[PDB]
Amino acid sequence: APPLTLEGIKDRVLYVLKLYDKIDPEKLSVNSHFMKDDSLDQVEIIMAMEDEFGFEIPDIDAEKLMCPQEIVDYIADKKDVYE
Template sequence: MFEKVVGIIREQLSVEDKEITMETSLMKDLEADSLDAVEIIMALEDEFSIEIPDTEAEGFKCIGDIVKFVEANK
């Protein structure tokens, strides 16, 4: 699951050269802005056929938070 989520994030942000771990922050480490975050959420929803409420998405602080949510809801 981690690899699929990271693949989507890499594609959306074009960050092939950066190391991404469960602790990586979208905003701080990968320099994603709010529009990037929305596009990533939409791509994840499409890929995994899940709904990610805005209230949940706002709570994602690191890649691990996203992976855990997807695993719990797919």
Template structure:
């Protein structure tokens, strides 16, 4: 009991007064400048957070076609790096690094290990919010 009273007394003294907008401003439905900035940053962040899957597919195919150890004619949207394109594990790592460079974000190692085809690369990149 005494502990709760001491806590309550301490919290009352630590409270910081918050400036509230005038009643007429709130009634009119206008948003303060700070709130407007917060809302605009949230909407800008979420608005462009994911890339179009078709655009990602085109860019991924282009990156793979430009990889020096790949025959461009063999590259298809469903091509597997090792089975269809003849890439070894080191080549696959280099291709994933090229994806990182193309799309401007770092792919974590545990996710990079799962990328073994153009389809898995497109699915991962298109679902990643940091891809540009």
């Protein structure tokens, strides 16, 4: 019964940048590309959304998730976000 729009995920992807204590809250907001910040930096960076979102994170979600806004892009396709 509660709906959802684009603004909820724009909070959370930017928030977990500061939640992870290895990444300071001085990086870029939506496009940091994660190479300027092999395992545990492509899985651990989304192991927190395994706790919060956690829709099992399929195998193709790793190679797309470099661009941190390209993380956000397909969730609205999955979560069926407004308009």
